Amino acid sequence: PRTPVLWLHGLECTGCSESFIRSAHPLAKDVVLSMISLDYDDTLMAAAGHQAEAILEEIMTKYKGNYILAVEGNPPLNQDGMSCIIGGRPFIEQLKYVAKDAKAIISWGSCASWGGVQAAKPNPTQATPVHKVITDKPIIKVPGCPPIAEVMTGVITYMLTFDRIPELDRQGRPKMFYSQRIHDKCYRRPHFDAGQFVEEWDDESARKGFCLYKMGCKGPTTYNACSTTRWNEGTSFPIQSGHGCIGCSEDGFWDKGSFYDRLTGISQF
Amino acid sequence: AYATQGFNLDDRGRRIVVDPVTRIEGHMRCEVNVDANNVIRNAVSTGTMWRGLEVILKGRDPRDAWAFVERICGVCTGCHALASVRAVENALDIRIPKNAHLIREIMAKTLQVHDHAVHFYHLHALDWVDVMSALKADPKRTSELQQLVSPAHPLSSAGYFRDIQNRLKRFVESGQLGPFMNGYWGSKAYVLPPEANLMAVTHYLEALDLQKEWVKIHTIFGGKNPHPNYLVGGVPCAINLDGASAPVNMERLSFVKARIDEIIEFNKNVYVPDVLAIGTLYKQAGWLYGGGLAATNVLDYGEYPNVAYNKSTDQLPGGAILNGNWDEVFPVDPRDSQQVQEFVSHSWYKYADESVGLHPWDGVTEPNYVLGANTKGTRTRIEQIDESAKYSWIKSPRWRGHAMEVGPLSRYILAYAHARSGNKYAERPKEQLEYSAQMINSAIPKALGLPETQYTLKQLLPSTIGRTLARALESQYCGEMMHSDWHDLVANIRAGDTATANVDKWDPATWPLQAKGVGTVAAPRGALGHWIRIKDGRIENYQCVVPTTWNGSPRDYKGQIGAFEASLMNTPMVNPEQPVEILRTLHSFDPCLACSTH
Ligand code: NFU
Ligand code: SF4
Ligand code: SF4
Ligand code: F3S
Numbered sequence: 001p002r003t004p005v006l007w008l009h010g011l012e013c014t015g016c017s018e019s020f021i022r023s024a025h026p027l028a029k030d031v032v033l034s035m036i037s038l039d040y041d042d043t044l045m046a047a048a049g050h051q052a053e054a055i056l057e058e059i060m061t062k063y064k065g066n067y068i069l070a071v072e073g074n075p076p077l078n079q080d081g082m083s084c085i086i087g088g089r090p091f092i093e094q095l096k097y098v099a100k101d102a103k104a105i106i107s108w109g110s111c112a113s114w115g116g117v118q119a120a121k122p123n124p125t126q127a128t129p130v131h132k133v134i135t136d137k138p139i140i141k142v143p144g145c146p147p148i149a150e151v152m153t154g155v156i157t158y159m160l161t162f163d164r165i166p167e168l169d170r171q172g173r174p175k176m177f178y179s180q181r182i183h184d185k186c187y188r189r190p191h192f193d194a195g196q197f198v199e200e201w202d203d204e205s206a207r208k209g210f211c212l213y214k215m216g217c218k219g220p221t222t223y224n225a226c227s228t229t230r231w232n233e234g235t236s237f238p239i240q241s242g243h244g245c246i247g248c249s250e251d252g253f254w255d256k257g258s259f260y261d262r263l264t265g266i267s268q269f
Numbered sequence: 270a271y272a273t274q275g276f277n278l279d280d281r282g283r284r285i286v287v288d289p290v291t292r293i294e295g296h297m298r299c300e301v302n303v304d305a306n307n308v309i310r311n312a313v314s315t316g317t318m319w320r321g322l323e324v325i326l327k328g329r330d331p332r333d334a335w336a337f338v339e340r341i342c343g344v345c346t347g348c349h350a351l352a353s354v355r356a357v358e359n360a361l362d363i364r365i366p367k368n369a370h371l372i373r374e375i376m377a378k379t380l381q382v383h384d385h386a387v388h389f390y391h392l393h394a395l396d397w398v399d400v401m402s403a404l405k406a407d408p409k410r411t412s413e414l415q416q417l418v419s420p421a422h423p424l425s426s427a428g429y430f431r432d433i434q435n436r437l438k439r440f441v442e443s444g445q446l447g448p449f450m451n452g453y454w455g456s457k458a459y460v461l462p463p464e465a466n467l468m469a470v471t472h473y474l475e476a477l478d479l480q481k482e483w484v485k486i487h488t489i490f491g492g493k494n495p496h497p498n499y500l501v502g503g504v505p506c507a508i509n510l511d512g513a514s515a516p517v518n519m520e521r522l523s524f525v526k527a528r529i530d531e532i533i534e535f536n537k538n539v540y541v542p543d544v545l546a547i548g549t550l551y552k553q554a555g556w557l558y559g560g561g562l563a564a565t566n567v568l569d570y571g572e573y574p575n576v577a578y579n580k581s582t583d584q585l586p587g588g589a590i591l592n593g594n595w596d597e598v599f600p601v602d603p604r605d606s607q608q609v610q611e612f613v614s615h616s617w618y619k620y621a622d623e624s625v626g627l628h629p630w631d632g633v634t635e636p637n638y639v640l641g642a643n644t645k646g647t648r649t650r651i652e653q654i655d656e657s658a659k660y661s662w663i664k665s666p667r668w669r670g671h672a673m674e675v676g677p678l679s680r681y682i683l684a685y686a687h688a689r690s691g692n693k694y695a696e697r698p699k700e701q702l703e704y705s706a707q708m709i710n711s712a713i714p715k716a717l718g719l720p721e722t723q724y725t726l727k728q729l730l731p732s733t734i735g736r737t738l739a740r741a742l743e744s745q746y747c748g749e750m751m752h753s754d755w756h757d758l759v760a761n762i763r764a765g766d767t768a769t770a771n772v773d774k775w776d777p778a779t780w781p782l783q784a785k786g787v788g789t790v791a792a793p794r795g796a797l798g799h800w801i802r803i804k805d806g807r808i809e810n811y812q813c814v815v816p817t818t819w820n821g822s823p824r825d826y827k828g829q830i831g832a833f834e835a836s837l838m839n840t841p842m843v844n845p846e847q848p849v850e851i852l853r854t855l856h857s858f859d860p861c862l863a864c865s866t867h
C-alpha cells in the first residue's frame with residue numbers, strides 16, 4: 001500500500017515538476033508506479049474539473065494523516081487570492097484545506113520555500129511562501145530553482161523508507177543535501193585559492209576554467225548539492241558549463257543585486 | 270448570441286465548467302455551452318494565474334533579464350531566455366559569434382523535441398488512449414500492430430508487451446490508480462482497439478525514461494535542465510579542444526552528438542509513427558473537429574535561419590495567412606506598431622483607453638481583477654464566469670486587428686504556403702506533410718484493412734488531428750536540423766574559431782543611454798516575443814507576448830474569439846459532464862498557462 005502524494009500547484013513555472021521527472025536514481029517511472037501513489041497532480045492526472053476535485057476529498061478521508069502534501073509554487077495574497085484560481089476559488093483555500101490532514105508537507109523549490117521569482121520586488125501578487133501560510137504542520141524545504149532531480153526523489157525516497165522527515169537545518173532544509181555550499185567542493189576552487197579569475201566572458205581565463213567569482217558567482221553563499229551530485233545524472237552544473245552560480249537555492253536570491261555583480265569581501269570566502 | 274469569424278456563438282444552452290483543466294502547464298478554467306444535442310456552441314477560455322514578471326523586471330539590469338523571464342516557464346525552459354538575450358542584443362546592436370548562434374540553435378531544437386514528445390505522451394495521449402482497454406489487449410497482435418506501425422523500432426516482441434501489460438494490471442489491481450484515478454475510461458469517445466492502446470501506453474513509459482537523456486544537451490551547454498544558463502552577447506560555455514578544463518571540448522560535443530542521434534531515432538521510430546497511426550484511426554472514426562482558427566488565420570514570426578541574422582533563410586519561414594488563403598503570406602514585422610497589439614477589453618488589466626490594442630514597446634501591465642455583473646457566484650467563489658466583461662489573466666494579442674492561431678500547425682501551414690510560392694528553405698516540412706497525408710489517407714488504412722480516404726492537406730490540417738500531427742512533424746524536423754547545426758559547429762571550431770561571446774558592449778558604460786529591442790523565438794507552442802526598452806542602463810519597460818497568450822486569449826474589443834475558444838466550437842460531446850473532447854482539443858494546442866500570463 002503506497003503512500004499517497006497530493007501534489008498541488010500554486011503560482012509556479014512547472015520547472016520543479018519537470019526536474020522531478022528527470023531523476024535517474026530512482027526513475028520517476030518507478031516512484032510513480034512502485035513507491036508512491038501520485039493521486040493529485042494537475043500536470044499528469046487523467047481527470048479534470050469536478051472529477052479531479054473529487055480525488056482530493058477521497059484520499060484525505062481514506063488516508064487522513066497518512067499522505068504527503070507536496071507543494072509546487074505558492075499562494076498570492078493580493079487580488080483577493082484570485083491571481084491563482086483553482087475551481088473558481090483562491091489557491092490559498094485549497095492549500096489550507098489539503099494541508100490540515102497531511103502527515104508531512106514538502107515545499108518544492110524556491111517558490112514554495114521562499115517566494116521565488118514572483119515574490120521578487122515589487123511582488124505584485126503578494127506571493128507568499130508555504131511555511132508563512134501553513135504554520136502548524138511539519139514542512140521540509142527543498143529549495144533550488146528548480147532543485148536537482150535526485151535531491152527531489154532522494155527526499156521522497158528517504159521519507160518513504162523511514163516514514164520520517166530527514167534531519168533539517170535551521171532554515172528547514174534537509175542536511176543530507178544542503179549542508180555544503182557550492183564553493184566548498186567546487187572543482188574551480190584551486191583557481192579561486194590562487195586568485196585565478198575570469199574577468200570577461202570568453203577570455204583566456206574562461207577557456208582555462210578559471211574561477212567565476214569576479215563574474216558574479218554566488219557559490220560562496222549558496223547551499224546546494226550542485227558541485228558534488230551535479231545535474232541531470234552528474235552531467236554538469238552551472239559553473240562547469242561556464243556560468244557563475246546565481247544563488248538559486250537561497251532565500252531572496254532574485255533581490256541580492258545583479259547576478260553578475262561579484263560578492264564583496266572576498267577575504268571572507 | 271452573436272456571430273464572429275464564421276462562428277455562431279450562443280450561450281443559451283447548458284453551461285458546463287472545467288476547472289481545473291488538467292494535463293496542461295499552469296492554471297486554466299474552461300466553460301462551454303452546449304445545445305440540445307451536446308454540440309458546443311460557446312467556449313470561454315480563462316487564464317487563472319498571474320505573477321507579474323513584466324512588473325518585476327522594471328528597473329533591473331537588462332543583462333539579468335533572461336534568468337527572470339526564463340522562470341516564466343520550466344516546460345518551455347530556455348525559450349524565454351533566448352528571446353530575452355535576443356531582445357537586449359537587438360537593443361544594443363550586439364552580434365553574437367557563430368558558435369554561440371549554433372549552440373543556441375541546438376539548445377532551442379533540443380527543447381522543441383523534448384517539449385513536443387513529452388507533451389504528446391505524458392499530457393496528450395490520455396485523450397486518445399484508454400489505459401484500461403490496454404489491460405485487455407492481446408500481447409501477440411500488439412506486436413503485429415507494432416511491426417506495421419513502425420517496422421524499424423526494435424522493441425516489438427509479445428513478451429515485452431505482456432511484461433508491460435502485467436505491471437499495469439498489478440498497478441490498477443492495487444486499488445491505487447494514481448494518475449489514472451477517476452479517468453474517463455470506457456467513454457465511447459475512445460475509439461482505439463486494445464492493441465493500439467497498449468502500444469501507446471508502452472511508448473508513454475519508454476518516452477518517460479528517454480526524455481531525461483535528451484536534455485543532457487542543455488546540461489552540457491547551459492549547466493542544468495530545467496533552466497539552463499544563457500548570456501547577453503553569446504554563451505557561457507567556453508571552448509577548448511586541447512590548448513578537460515573548459516566547458517566545451519570534443520568529448521562533450523561527441524556526447525551531444527550521441528544524444529542528437531538518439532533523438533532522431535525516437536522521432537522517426539516512435540513519435541511520428543504513433544501520431545500517424547492514432548491520427549489515422551481517429552480520422553477513420555470521423556473525428557476531424559477542432560480546426561478553429563487554423564482554417565483561416567495563422568501566424569509565426571519565422572525561425573531557424575541557416576545563415577545567422579538573415580531571415581530570408583528561415584527554415585521554418587513565417588508570416589501571416591488570412592481567410593484560408595494559402596497563396597498569400599503577409600510578412601510580419603514585430604517592430605511595426607500597427608501589427609502586433611494586445612487588448613485587455615476582456616482581460617483583468619487596465620489601460621488608459623481599452624478600445625485600442627497596445628504594441629508591446631508601449632505595453633502596460635496593471636492588474637485589474639474585476640468580475641462582470643452577470644457572474645454567478647462571488648469574487649472569491651466563481652460558479653459561472655461572465656465572458657461579456659473581463660474574464661482572464663491572459664491579454665488579447667491580435668495582428669493588424671485579426672485573431673490568429675499560433676503553434677507548430679501554423680508554422681507547418683506557413684511552410685507549406687511558402688514552399689508552393691517557391692521558397693526552397695521549406696522543402697522538408699512540405700515533404701513531411703505530403704508523406705504524412707499519404708500515410709493517413711492510404712498506406713496505414715491499407716495495412717490495417719481500413720477504407721482509403723482522399724482528404725487534402727487543406728481539409729486535414731485544420732483539425733485537432735492535424736494540430737497534433739504538425740507538432741510531431743516539427744519535432745522530427747528540429748532533430749534533423751540540430752544534427753546539421755552540430756556539424757557546422759564542430760567544423761567552425763576545427764577551422765580555428767573558438768569564440769563564444771562578444772563582450773564589446775557587455776559593460777553598460779558602452780551602451781546608448783536609451784534604446785529599444787525586440788527578440789522573437791519560434792517557441793514550442795508558437796510565436797514568442799520579448800520587447801524591451803532600456804534607459805540609463807536599466808529596464809524601462811519589458812513586455813512579453815507568448816504563444817499561449819495568442820491561442821488562449823479572451824475576446825478582444827471587437828468581440829473576436831481566440832484560437833482555444835474557436836477550436837472548441839461546433840464539437841459534439843459524447844457526455845456533456847465528461848470533458849474528453851474539450852481536453853483532446855485544448856491539449857492539441859499544448860497550453861502553457863504560466864507562459865500565457867507570465
Ligand atoms: N512554447 C512555449 Fe511557452 Ni511554457 C508558451 N506558450 C513560451 O514562449
Ligand atoms: S522554484 Fe523555480 S523552477 Fe520551481 S516553480 Fe519556482 S520558478 Fe519554477
Ligand atoms: S566562486 Fe564560484 S566558480 Fe569560484 S570556486 Fe567558488 S563556487 Fe567555484
Ligand atoms: S544557480 Fe542554482 S542550480 Fe546550483 S550552482 Fe547555483 S544553486
Ligand SMILES: [Mg+2]
Nearest residue numbers: 664812813814
Ligand atoms: Mg505580456
